[PDB]
């Protein structure tokens, strides 16, 4: 009942967005690159892409990593494994009798339950 509290500056919000912009500026500072060896495929209009000019920053951070740059790529061969096996499976020849007796994940199969 009527405590008469003065304003506390610690409860204000005048540093969160500046700090976030400081972090983002620290991020974008590592995107600075030299002119030598520079190449970027622009769009057909000649205008730049979106993701294109922000690959150097990501790979400059990958440069500074220690373990992820030597581990996180080992899941990438698995993508080509799928690319190959999918194409093998798009046209795989199978037995008609076995397909009619044991269709995979087909509906109204009483052996499954429904």
């Amino acid at each position: 009942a009527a405590p008469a509290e003065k304003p506390d500056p610690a409860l204000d919000a005048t540093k969160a967005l500046p700090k976030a912009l400081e972090e983002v500026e620290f991020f974008q500072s590592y995107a600075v690159r030299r002119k030598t060896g520079f190449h970027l495929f622009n769009r057909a209009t000649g205008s730049p892409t979106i993701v294109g000019p922000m690959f150097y920053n990501l790979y400059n951070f990958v440069r500074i990593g220690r373990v992820s740059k030597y581990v996180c790529w080992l899941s990438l061969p698995l993508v080509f494994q799928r690319m190959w096996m999918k194409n093998r499976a798009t046209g795989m020849e199978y037995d008609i009798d076995l397909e009619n007796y044991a269709p995979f994940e087909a509906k109204k199969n009483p052996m499954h339950g429904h």
């Binding site: 190449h39 190959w84 194409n87 046209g91």
Partner: protein
């Protein structure tokens, strides 16, 4: 040393793809195409034919040849033609029978 140079050479290659393409276009239109250019283009077409075969192998999914081709698979179209002919032949008879039955029931009751 080679890994560093192999990486560093990628920008040069991607930059000179368009450059070499434009000169090739200019040389074909202008007609100023010489023996060395012809040899390089023939080497290019050989490698392209090889990678075309390789892409066929990758896209088929089989290393030997296509699948679901052959007279065993082509005959199913003629089998379907005959099956549809038989099915329509029987369906016309059944529909005529049912229509006669319905016309009987209607002209008897209605």
């Amino acid at each position: 040393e080679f890994w560093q140079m192999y990486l560093a050479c990628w920008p040069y290659r991607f930059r000179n793809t368009v450059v070499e393409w434009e000169t090739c276009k200019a040389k074909v239109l202008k007609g100023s195409v010489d023996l060395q250019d012809i040899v390089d283009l023939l080497y290019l077409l050989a490698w392209a034919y090889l990678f075309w075969i390789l892409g066929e192998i990758y896209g088929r999914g089989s290393l030997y040849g296509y699948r679901f081709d052959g007279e065993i698979h082509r005959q199913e179209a003629q089998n379907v033609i005959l099956y549809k002919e038989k099915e329509a032949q029987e369906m016309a008879v059944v529909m005529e029978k049912l229509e006669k039955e319905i016309q009987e029931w209607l002209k008897t009751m209605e």
